[PDB]
Symmetry: D2
Subunit: 97 residues, 4 copies
Amino acid sequence: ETPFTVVGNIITNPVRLRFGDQELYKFRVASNSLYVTVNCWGNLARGVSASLGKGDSVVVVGHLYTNEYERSSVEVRATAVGPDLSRCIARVEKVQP
Amino acid sequence: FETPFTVVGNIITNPVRLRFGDQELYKFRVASNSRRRNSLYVTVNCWGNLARGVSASLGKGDSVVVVGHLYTNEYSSVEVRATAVGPDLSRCIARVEK
Amino acid sequence: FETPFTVVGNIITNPVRLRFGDQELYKFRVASNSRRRNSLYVTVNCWGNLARGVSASLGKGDSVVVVGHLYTNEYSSVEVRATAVGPDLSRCIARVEK
Amino acid sequence: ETPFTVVGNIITNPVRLRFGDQELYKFRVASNSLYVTVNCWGNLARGVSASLGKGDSVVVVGHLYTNEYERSSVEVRATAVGPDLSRCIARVEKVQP
Ligand SMILES: [Ca+2]
Ligand SMILES: [Ca+2]
């Protein structure tokens, strides 16, 4: 419940990870400096893996949090991600349910 | 000291293009996808390269992520000067071209 | 999926209290401190403990930080359901009591 | 130019630091989880040192960035800070220029 928006560029090769039913798509974003790891789940992990990659210019919206581990780092739980249409063009396709 | 703003929702009008010598405006109305089991309507203004990307890529009904700065115009209407707009990839797919 | 919002500026009206059985509303208008060498006007609504803190602490002219969620009401007016409000300590001092 | 807002509590004893003409007032904030270091400068460092302390409930607005050093961590360059009047009361005093 700390909302957060970052506009920038994916700077790593995203990675998919599975947890049975569920899917995570993870990547790093740089802003224009801020470096943050973005985590997409579900249908968002889908849209993003199908559409974006390293070097793409991106708009990320979600919630910011700290993740402690064996250091502690700052990450986004994304709720919406899109390509930044100031820097590119997109063909949009809906996914039949 | 501008007021930053983000809205996620859907374009709900047919966007309107306007040219001013060099410059281009593309503007449209956005409704936010709030849920109860509370709505937000705003006019978004895209300029420049952003106007171009958006007119080539999005239209009435499409899901959107809009980032920019919020303004009131007493002319009184609440408007966003967008800095980045994209389709919402939680609700769609995009084939990206530069 | 509410739309979060933050505005920093000044209260520019005398706030208005309204009671509804248990509940209290304190509402007022805010202008944002934008600079040129572009304004934003919004109605802010505080409820509950926030209505109490704000009525005890702030009034017309005071500098404010407002955090909450943004709404349009077609009744059409743009309003904030505030979650946290405070004086802007870049422009003032506050002696805090709980 | 990545804007950011956090509402929470100061959880360390703030510290003042000087650089000649200029003053920094630094403290840690927790949200309701996110931990972030907040940096106030100038008149903001003033208002905040004069008004707040460990345990106070706070509204922080500014810009988020990453700071690299001998690790890298996420910090806020605050532009406005106030006590959260949902959790307290305040007497406001203007500072004659
Ligand atoms: Ca990949
Ligand atoms: Ca101290």
